[PDB]
Structure 1
Amino acid sequence: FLISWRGYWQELIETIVWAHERTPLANLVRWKDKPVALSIVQARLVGLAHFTVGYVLTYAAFLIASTAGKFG
Structure 2
Amino acid sequence: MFLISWRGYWQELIETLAWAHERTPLANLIRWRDKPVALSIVQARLVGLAHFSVGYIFTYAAFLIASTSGKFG
TM-score between the two structures when normalised by the length of structure 2: 0.97
Identity of paired residues, percent?
A: 89
Structure 2 partner of 1:62: 63
Q: Which secondary structure state, in structure 2, belongs to the residue aligned with residue 17 of structure 1?
A: helix
- Which structure 1 residue ranges, 5 or more long, are not aligned? none
In the TM superposition, residue 32 of structure 1 has moved relative to its aligned partner by: 0.9
Whether 2:38 is the aligned partner of 1:37: answer yes
Report how many residues are paired: 72
Whole-angstrom distance in 2 between the partners of 1:3 and 1:18: 26
Q: Hey, what's the Cα distance between the residues in 2 that align with 1:68 and 1:29?
A: 52
Q: CA RMSD in A?
A: 0.4
Structure 1 consecutive aligned stretches of length 4 or more whose deviation exceeds 6 Å = none
Kindly indicate whether residue 32 of structure 2 is the aligned counterpart of residue 22 of structure 1: no
The structure with more helix, counted as a fraction of residues: 1
